[PDB]
Ligand binder design. Sequence first.
Ligand SMILES: C[C@@H](O)[C@H](N)C(=O)N[C@H]1[C@@H](O)[C@H](n2cnc3c(N)ncnc32)O[C@@H]1CO
Ligand SMILES: C[C@@H](O)[C@H](N)C(=O)N[C@H]1[C@@H](O)[C@H](n2cnc3c(N)ncnc32)O[C@@H]1CO
Lengths: 136, 136
Amino acid sequence: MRLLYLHADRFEYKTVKPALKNPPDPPGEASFGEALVVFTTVEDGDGPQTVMYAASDIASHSSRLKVTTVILYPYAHLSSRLAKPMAAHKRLIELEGALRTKFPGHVHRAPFGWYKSFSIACKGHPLAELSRSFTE
Amino acid sequence: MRLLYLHADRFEYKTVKPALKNPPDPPGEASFGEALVVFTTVEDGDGPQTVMYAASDIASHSSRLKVTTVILYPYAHLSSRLAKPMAAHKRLIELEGALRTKFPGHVHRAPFGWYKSFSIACKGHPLAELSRSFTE
Ligand SMILES: C[C@@H](O)[C@H](N)C(=O)N[C@H]1[C@@H](O)[C@H](n2cnc3c(N)ncnc32)O[C@@H]1CO
Ligand SMILES: C[C@@H](O)[C@H](N)C(=O)N[C@H]1[C@@H](O)[C@H](n2cnc3c(N)ncnc32)O[C@@H]1CO
C-alpha cells in the first residue's frame, strides 16, 4: 500500500466517467474544509495487517496535525504494483472500517472505479505532504 | 525518474519555508490557466538519457492533450529511490532545457528545495492523471 498524506485547507471531487466496466461505488461528489486527504494505492499483496498498519499511522498523523476529517481517496497512480480492482476495493472498505476504530473524526471514503476531477488547496507547512508505504 | 501528469484547468503554488538548508532556487509563486502539471521525483540513477526520454514523453503527452503550458513541479514524494538534492536540482535544470527542444509551449520550472502550498483543479477526463517512470 502506497499512500500520500495531503493536509488540505480544502478538498472536493466529483466522479466523471466510469473507469472500470462495473464501478462498485455509485457516482458522487463532496467538498470539505480542513482535512487530511489520503491518496491511496492498493498494492498486490496488501491484506489485513497492511490495513491495520495504515489505519494506525493515518490516525496518529491526523492526531499530530490536529485534523478531524480524513478522506480516503482511491488513487491508481502512486506505485507500479497495484492490486486488481476487486481486491483493491475490498482493502479500501477494510481500511475505512479499521480507521474508524483508531480515529474519532470524520472518515470519508471516496468512490472507487471512476475517473474524477478534484480540487485541493494543500497546506504549505512542513508535514502537509508526506508519503507512506505499508506491507505485510 | 517518477512523474505524475496532472492535466489541470488551473494551478498555482507559493513556496513557504525552506526545506533544505540551502535552497538553490529563490522563493516565489505563480498561477496558471490550463496546464499539464508534471510532479517530478528525481531518482538515484537518472542521467541525460532519462531526461531526454521524459522530455520526449512530456512533449508528446502535451501534444495529445493540446496543452501549451507545462509546469515542472519538483516533488520528493512519488517514489522511494530519490536522487540527492544536488543531483536532483541538476536533472530538473536539464529536464527543463530538454523539454524546450521538444515542446513549443510555456515551460515553467517551479523552485526546488522549498515546502510549498499549492492549489490545483485537476481535470476529470480519462488522461488528466497518468504516471510515468523513466530510467537509463
Ligand atoms: C483516474 C483518477 O482520476 C482516479 N483518482 C483514480 O485513480 N481512479 C481509480 C480508482 O478509483 C480505482 N482503482 C483501480 N485500482 C486501484 C488500486 N489498485 N488502488 C486504488 N484504486 C484503484 O479505479 C479507478 C481507475 O483505476
Ligand atoms: C515538500 C513539498 O511541499 C514540496 N513539493 C517538495 O517535495 N519539495 C522538495 C523538492 O522541491 C526538493 N527535492 C528534494 N529531493 C528531490 C528529488 N529527489 N526530486 C525532486 N525534488 C526534490 O526539496 C524539497 C524537499 O524535499
